[PDB]
Design a protein around this ligand. Structure first.
Ligand code: MG
Ligand code: MG
Ligand code: MG
Ligand code: MG
Ligand code: MG
Ligand code: MG
Ligand code: MG
Ligand code: MG
Ligand code: MG
Ligand code: MG
Ligand code: MG
Ligand code: MG
Ligand code: MG
Ligand code: MG
Ligand code: MG
Ligand code: MG
Ligand code: MG
Ligand code: MG
Ligand code: MG
Ligand code: MG
Ligand code: MG
Ligand code: MG
Ligand code: MG
Ligand code: MG
Ligand code: MG
Ligand code: MG
Ligand code: MG
Ligand code: MG
Ligand code: MG
Ligand code: MG
Ligand code: MG
Ligand code: MG
Ligand code: MG
Ligand code: MG
Ligand code: MG
Ligand code: MG
Ligand code: MG
Ligand code: MG
Ligand code: MG
Ligand code: MG
Ligand code: MG
Ligand code: MG
Ligand code: MG
Ligand code: MG
Ligand code: MG
Ligand code: MG
Ligand code: MG
Ligand code: MG
Ligand code: MG
Ligand code: MG
Ligand code: MG
Ligand code: MG
Ligand code: MG
Ligand code: MG
Ligand code: MG
Ligand code: MG
Ligand code: MG
Ligand code: MG
Ligand code: MG
Ligand code: MG
Ligand code: MG
Ligand code: MG
Ligand code: MG
Ligand code: MG
Ligand code: MG
Ligand code: MG
Ligand code: MG
Ligand code: MG
Ligand code: MG
Ligand code: MG
Ligand code: MG
Ligand code: MG
Ligand code: MG
Ligand code: MG
Ligand code: MG
Ligand code: MG
Ligand code: MG
Ligand code: MG
Ligand code: MG
Ligand code: MG
Ligand code: MG
Ligand code: MG
Ligand code: MG
Ligand code: MG
Ligand code: MG
Ligand code: MG
Ligand code: MG
Ligand code: MG
Ligand code: MG
Ligand code: MG
Ligand code: MG
Ligand code: MG
Ligand code: MG
Ligand code: MG
Ligand code: MG
Ligand code: MG
Ligand code: MG
Ligand code: MG
Ligand code: MG
Ligand code: MG
Ligand code: MG
Ligand code: MG
Ligand code: MG
Ligand code: MG
Ligand code: MG
Ligand code: MG
Ligand code: MG
Ligand code: MG
Ligand code: MG
Ligand code: MG
Ligand code: MG
Ligand code: MG
Ligand code: MG
Ligand code: MG
Ligand code: MG
Ligand code: MG
Ligand code: MG
Ligand code: MG
Ligand code: MG
Ligand code: MG
Ligand code: MG
Ligand code: MG
Ligand code: MG
Ligand code: MG
Lengths: 100, 63, 202, 146
RNA sequence: AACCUGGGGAACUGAAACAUCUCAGUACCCAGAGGAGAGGAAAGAGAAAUCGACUCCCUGAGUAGCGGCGAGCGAAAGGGGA
RNA sequence: AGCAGCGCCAGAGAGGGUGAAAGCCCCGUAGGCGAAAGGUGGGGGGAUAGGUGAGGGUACCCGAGUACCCCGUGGUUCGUGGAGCCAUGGGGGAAUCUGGGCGGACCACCGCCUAAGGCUAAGUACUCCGGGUGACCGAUAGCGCACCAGUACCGUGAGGGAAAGGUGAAAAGAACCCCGGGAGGGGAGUGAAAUAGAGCCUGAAACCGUGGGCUUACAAGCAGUCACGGCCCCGCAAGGGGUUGUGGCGUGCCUAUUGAAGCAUGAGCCGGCGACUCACGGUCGUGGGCGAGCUUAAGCCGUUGAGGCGGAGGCGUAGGGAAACCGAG
């Protein structure tokens, strides 16, 4: 509980470091470590693989998780904080001064 | 906590208004048998002490 | 001294006062110390060789053992052992004579007034608890914020204003204490609060 | 005035002495050097020699006690008419206790040195010599009775 | 866990030995109570023709007094409070 | 998130986090909403149980092995004291208001209170549990336990009882090649950094080792010091650093002692742990407030690192005497 945070799976800006300014859809959000997967921090793992099955695993430079604080959601206007407004029934979240 | 007054010494020693300590003359109750009228009279009055006067002061302190 | 600056919608009518002249630096200190000592909380505590988990058994015979010579491990010379004169909880406060509490209080205010920083205001355009308002009022009041200010006043709304403002410390009328006074560079207090200050001393 | 430089005015000086150092008070305690300086000597003020304490003196004090204890008897407070003459009007036990030198003491008894101002002085007892001073310019209101 | 009440109840130690005394009705064993427990509406206090259940704090007071009148031990009424 | 530039919020500039030092990036903070369900709840309201009178006659009742007395003891400040009051193990043993207990033996007087049946909230104590705060600790500290500890291990048992925290921002945790059986290395590669490489931050000291400089096989020593000389090393020189050839001189440290280099004590060496404190009262000194006055204690009100109120009480203004008493004596 309460583990919830900023955004989810969608479009987001990265105000981090090595990938400052960059923008992209967050393909994953792991709340346990409070980090999210975007398209920015992607480092090269040399490892063949941890599990012997499937001989070739990948020298892949796949996406590395990223602290969920350096990424900010976004809308028609670039990079915005997140207010929330209760709809005529449900509970939707408007941006700095617009909708959704 | 709270020093207790030494009752045994209050019961036998009054401190003067200045700071002196007075008490009755010793040896007048028992040894007696027939001593010069001078003795028993000299023994009637009270006296002042010296150094231990300060010792005994440090008991009747709350007093 | 006497003549204190006063501020009102009508203008800067400079009034006067009755506060003493001689400021005893030391006396002031005593009172500041006293405030800071009463607030202390004797929360610091350690466990004596007595209050400690270990047993009581003598560790060795003490004879033809060839070892040193000991009792229980709880002994202070025994890493893990009890502490020697380690702090226990205790009260750090005392009753500083009332006469002095008043003396210092006057002298503090008096001092701040003699430097010419005591401003007795009255006009408060700051209608509600809105920092902006007070920030404006103070701007036109000569309080650019280049100086720490002990704003004393009865109005809880005026509080709301300077409350969050960093370079300012709000405070109730009876809250007057030499510490917060001396603490700040400027002192500004409502005339109604100056009346209650006058009640304790004036 | 700022927080710097209010410090104690050159004589508070919490300079407590530290006995384990190596210069000043050193190997032994502040003073010690011997034995039976280790945990505590007898009293010794009122007490120790080992011989008959100076308790050789003797209790003359009679009435020194009794089982049920103290007897409830009226306590007379000596109040000099010198301090009495200080203020002026009509001195009664009420006034002297309200502010002065009574302190709820059971009774009042004016007396002694000083010069008597003209006024009624209600007390519970008057010194023979005290009755003269006030008689020579005032009234002598004695105590109650019932 | 500790707090509480009742039944039973030490010694070291202090007294610069020690036996009364002190440590202490403490340590502890036991029975019981509960968010508390105990106490509680006078066959009271005690000197004021006064007070007005009980408990708790401040004071009274290291007073009164007890005491191999040693070491030590140590109330109550009354007054200010909850 | 530093620094420079231009802004903005603030009933919120407590704090924590984010690759380093952010009011405005994230979680919060100020301010403000909220329970179908369970618990709590006279605070507000309602209801019931219950209770409420004047004068006169009668003298029926008003707590029994009880009061009371005596023997033995306990409790209280009370240690047998002149020894009451309360309680009661043993023996004797009443009365019902013309009754009966108490006011420190006992008696009379005056006054107090109604024993021998029971119940009663609050104020009070504590802290296993939750939270908040710290001129509290920071892994030899702090709880015995920051870590799968009342564990391992020890003891028949009761019981005793440890050690042990930290890669980095991210695992990116080092594919592939080379030596090797492996372990471990060497390249390569990641990383800001790899003597941050995995019980991995920093990484001190004792202790072991490799390389270099000065030095030593006719020499006698608490191991140093003073001098001169030689060799090497920083600077042009003047100077300074290192080393030791010869000469002069020279009885370890601590403790304890009349006396120790002592053939008196203690110490293998290094690192860490380790001993004059606090509470109340007292006495002298000292800084300051007030002054024949000075000062508050619980507590109440305020505050949430604010004070104020509260004179009950204490010390002081008179002493002397065992006391009655007297009083500048
Ligand atoms: Mg598959
Ligand atoms: Mg491959
Ligand atoms: Mg004299
Ligand atoms: Mg005789
Ligand atoms: Mg004879
Ligand atoms: Mg003769
Ligand atoms: Mg004679
Ligand atoms: Mg006294
Ligand atoms: Mg123990
Ligand atoms: Mg244990
Ligand atoms: Mg022991
Ligand atoms: Mg034992
Ligand atoms: Mg032996
Ligand atoms: Mg040995
Ligand atoms: Mg230790
Ligand atoms: Mg340990
Ligand atoms: Mg250990
Ligand atoms: Mg410890
Ligand atoms: Mg207070
Ligand atoms: Mg502020
Ligand atoms: Mg010295
Ligand atoms: Mg000493
Ligand atoms: Mg000892
Ligand atoms: Mg001793
Ligand atoms: Mg001795
Ligand atoms: Mg002898
Ligand atoms: Mg004994
Ligand atoms: Mg003795
Ligand atoms: Mg013996
Ligand atoms: Mg006892
Ligand atoms: Mg008992
Ligand atoms: Mg309660
Ligand atoms: Mg109860
Ligand atoms: Mg009850
Ligand atoms: Mg009861
Ligand atoms: Mg009961
Ligand atoms: Mg009672
Ligand atoms: Mg209490
Ligand atoms: Mg007291
Ligand atoms: Mg006694
Ligand atoms: Mg006793
Ligand atoms: Mg006792
Ligand atoms: Mg009372
Ligand atoms: Mg009361
Ligand atoms: Mg800087
Ligand atoms: Mg705040
Ligand atoms: Mg900064
Ligand atoms: Mg921040
Ligand atoms: Mg909130
Ligand atoms: Mg809701
Ligand atoms: Mg609600
Ligand atoms: Mg209930
Ligand atoms: Mg209910
Ligand atoms: Mg409800
Ligand atoms: Mg209630
Ligand atoms: Mg009804
Ligand atoms: Mg009627
Ligand atoms: Mg009749
Ligand atoms: Mg009859
Ligand atoms: Mg009948
Ligand atoms: Mg009948
Ligand atoms: Mg019955
Ligand atoms: Mg009786
Ligand atoms: Mg007894
Ligand atoms: Mg008895
Ligand atoms: Mg007893
Ligand atoms: Mg007792
Ligand atoms: Mg006896
Ligand atoms: Mg009986
Ligand atoms: Mg009858
Ligand atoms: Mg009848
Ligand atoms: Mg009858
Ligand atoms: Mg009748
Ligand atoms: Mg009858
Ligand atoms: Mg009597
Ligand atoms: Mg009568
Ligand atoms: Mg009575
Ligand atoms: Mg009854
Ligand atoms: Mg209660
Ligand atoms: Mg807790
Ligand atoms: Mg360690
Ligand atoms: Mg360590
Ligand atoms: Mg744990
Ligand atoms: Mg874990
Ligand atoms: Mg072990
Ligand atoms: Mg075994
Ligand atoms: Mg052990
Ligand atoms: Mg790291
Ligand atoms: Mg890891
Ligand atoms: Mg990890
Ligand atoms: Mg390896
Ligand atoms: Mg490499
Ligand atoms: Mg490298
Ligand atoms: Mg390497
Ligand atoms: Mg190195
Ligand atoms: Mg490193
Ligand atoms: Mg390596
Ligand atoms: Mg390895
Ligand atoms: Mg780090
Ligand atoms: Mg080694
Ligand atoms: Mg070796
Ligand atoms: Mg040689
Ligand atoms: Mg050159
Ligand atoms: Mg030079
Ligand atoms: Mg030489
Ligand atoms: Mg000597
Ligand atoms: Mg030798
Ligand atoms: Mg020997
Ligand atoms: Mg020896
Ligand atoms: Mg030694
Ligand atoms: Mg040896
Ligand atoms: Mg050693
Ligand atoms: Mg006290
Ligand atoms: Mg002291
Ligand atoms: Mg003196
Ligand atoms: Mg002093
Ligand atoms: Mg001076
Ligand atoms: Mg005052
Ligand atoms: Mg107190
Ligand atoms: Mg109020
Ligand atoms: Mg409050
Ligand atoms: Mg505040
Ligand atoms: Mg006096
Ligand atoms: Mg004279």
């Amino acid at each position: 509980r309460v583990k919830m945070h900023v955004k989810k799976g969608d479009t987001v800006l990265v105000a981090s470091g090595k990938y400052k300014g960059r923008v992209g859809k967050v393909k994953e959000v792991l709340p346990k470590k409070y980090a999210v997967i975007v398209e920015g921090v992607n480092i090269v793992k040399k490892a063949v693989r941890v599990s012997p099955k499937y001989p070739q695993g990948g020298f892949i430079e796949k996406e590395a998780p990223l602290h969920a604080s350096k990424v900010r959601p976004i809308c028609p206007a670039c990079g915005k904080p997140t207010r929330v407004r209760k709809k005529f029934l449900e509970n939707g979240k408007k941006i700095r001064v617009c909708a959704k | 906590p709270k020093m207790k007054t030494h009752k045994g010494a209050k019961k036998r020693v009054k401190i003067t208004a200045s700071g002196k300590v007075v008490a009755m003359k010793t040896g007048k109750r028992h040894l007696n048998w027939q001593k010069s009228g001078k003795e028993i009279r000299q023994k009637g009055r009270k006296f002042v002490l010296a150094k231990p006067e300060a010792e005994r002061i440090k008991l009747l302190l709350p007093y | 001294m006497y003549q204190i600056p006063v501020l009102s919608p009508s203008g800067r009518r400079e009034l006067a006062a009755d506060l003493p002249a001689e400021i005893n630096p030391h006396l002031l200190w005593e009172v500041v110390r006293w405030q800071l000592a009463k607030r202390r909380r004797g929360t610091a505590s350690t466990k004596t060789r007595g209050e400690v988990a270990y047993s009581g058994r003598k560790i060795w015979p003490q004879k033809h053992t060839g070892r040193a010579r000991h009792g229980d491990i709880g002994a202070p010379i025994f890493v893990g052992g009890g502490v020697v004169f380690g702090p226990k909880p205790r009260d750090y406060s005392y009753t500083l004579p009332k006469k002095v509490r008043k003396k210092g209080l006057a002298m503090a205010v008096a001092d701040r007034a003699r430097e010419g920083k005591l401003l007795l205001v009255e006009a408060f355009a700051g209608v509600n608890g809105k920092t902006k308002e007070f920030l404006a009022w103070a701007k036109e009041a000569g309080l650019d914020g280049s100086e720490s200010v002990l704003l004393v006043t009865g109005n809880e709304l005026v509080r709301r204003a300077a409350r969050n403002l960093p370079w300012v410390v709000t405070l109730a009328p009876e809250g007057l204490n030499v510490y917060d006074i001396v603490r700040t560079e400027r002192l500004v207090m409502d005339l109604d609060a100056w009346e209650v200050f006058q009640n304790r001393i004036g | 005035d700022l927080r710097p430089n209010p410090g104690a005015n050159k004589r508070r000086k919490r300079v407590g002495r530290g006995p384990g150092s190596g210069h000043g008070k050193t190997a032994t305690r502040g003073h010690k050097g011997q034995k039976s300086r280790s945990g505590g000597l007898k009293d010794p003020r009122r007490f120790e020699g080992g011989r008959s304490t100076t308790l050789m003196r003797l209790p003359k004090r009679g009435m020194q006690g009794q089982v049920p204890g103290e007897i409830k008897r009226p306590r007379y407070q000596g109040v000099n008419l010198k301090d009495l003459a200080r203020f002026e009007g009509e001195v009664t036990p009420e006034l002297l206790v309200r502010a002065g030198l009574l302190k709820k003491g059971y009774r009042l008894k004016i007396l002694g040195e000083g010069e008597a101002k003209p006024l009624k002085v209600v007390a519970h007892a008057f010194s023979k010599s005290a009755l003269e001073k006030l008689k020579a310019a005032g009234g002598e209101p004695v105590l109650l009775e019932a």
